[PDB]
Amino acid sequence: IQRTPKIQVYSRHPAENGKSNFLNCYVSGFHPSDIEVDLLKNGERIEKVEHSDLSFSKDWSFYLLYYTEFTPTEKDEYACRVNHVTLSQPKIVKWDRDM
């Protein structure tokens, strides 16, 4: 077996245009552990993006947090782009301010 990641992209605080924040992508429930996660701003890949250390849950499955400092505006659109064997093509999830 192999497990396809559960993906969430969200801000650390409730979005308010012009006040800085953090963009998170959280990936969980997956296997094997190789994975590539990028964050996109209007389609382009963001340069500086941190991630947590690899860890896993009670079942055996892996999870990671990727995140970056940012300032959301009305104009800008964000997405997380996730790359894993279990996916024929990378999954791109748009940032929804309320999920």
Binding site: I1, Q8, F22, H31, D34, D53, L54, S55, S61, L65
Partner: protein, 274 residues
């Protein structure tokens, strides 16, 4: 309440590309405090929580030694598991390890753990009585006979009820400010129409610690699985956690629905309505 300490280690083989990648991390409850990465440059057990920096060099030297050695052991186990399972040297496998203990409110030992998974599947584990092993299959049975011979269980039992719980209580003391805090969820509800006959109700929990939380929807005082969505509990990144739950709801029937929030930082459980 209770507490736990956990260590997790992961080895991933990559044939042709050299040595297995190895990564170990350690937690107290939901707060991470050490990590080691075979691919990083330090080659050192590294601190990841404020209240662990205060450990002396002797502590960092030993933790490094233990975890470097452990990575060689799991390097070895990877090769062995290939043989037991009769798999080719071409592909890639994962070996995961988990070790730790739980204590109670009095600080007394509640439970010990020590288990392995190969390729994401149970391999061998120490049972609750910390006296015998559970082996998932024929291959793990071989290892089980070995560790019975070697009296491994009894070593590990003595470590778990001793060193593990003593280190845990020592860490809980060193990080009192932080690890014994109990942040309740801040909650609110959101509402979006989906059509002229339906709307989404979303029930939010934010800024809580520890991660353990229950969010449940009721219609007219009865639980509802049907038409619910419930995301995994997620880190905010500043040390707190986040979760939500949602139901799709016929229009103008919002008032029949209630969201129940449970969490140990909460005196009484909370009830939200739209």
């Amino acid at each position: 309440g209770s507490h736990s300490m956990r260590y997790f280690s992961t080895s991933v083989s990559r044939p042709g590309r050299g040595e297995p990648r190895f990564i170990a991390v350690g937690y107290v409850d939901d707060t991470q405090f050490v990590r080691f990465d075979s691919d990083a440059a330090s080659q050192r057990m590294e601190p990841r929580a404020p209240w662990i920096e205060q450990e002396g060099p002797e502590y960092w030297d030993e933790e490094t030694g233990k975890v470097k050695a452990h990575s060689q052991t799991d390097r070895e186990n990877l090769r062995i598991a290939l043989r037991y399972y009769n798999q080719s040297e071409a592909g890639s496998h994962t070996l995961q390890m988990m070790f730790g203990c739980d204590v109670g409110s009095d600080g007394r030992f509640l439970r010990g753990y020590h288990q392995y998974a190969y390729d994401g599947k149970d391999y061998i584990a120490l049972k609750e009585d910390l006296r015998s092993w559970t082996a998932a299959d024929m291959a793990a049975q071989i290892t089980k006979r070995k560790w019975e011979a070697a009296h491994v269980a009894e070593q590990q039992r003595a470590y778990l009820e001793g060193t593990c719980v003593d280190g845990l209580r020592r860490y809980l003391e060193n990080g009192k400010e932080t690890l014994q805090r109990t942040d309740p969820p801040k909650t609110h509800m959101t509402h979006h129409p989906i059509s002229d006959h339906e709307a989404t109700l979303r029930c939010w929990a934010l800024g809580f610690y520890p991660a353990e939380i229950t969010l449940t929807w009721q219609r007219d005082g009865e639980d509802q699985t049907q038409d619910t969505e419930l995301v995994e509990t997620r880190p905010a990144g500043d040390g707190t956690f986040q979760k939500w739950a949602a139901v799709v709801v016929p229009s103008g029937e919002e008032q029949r629905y209630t969201c129940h929030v449970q969490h140990e930082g909460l005196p009484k459980p909370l009830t939200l309505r739209w």
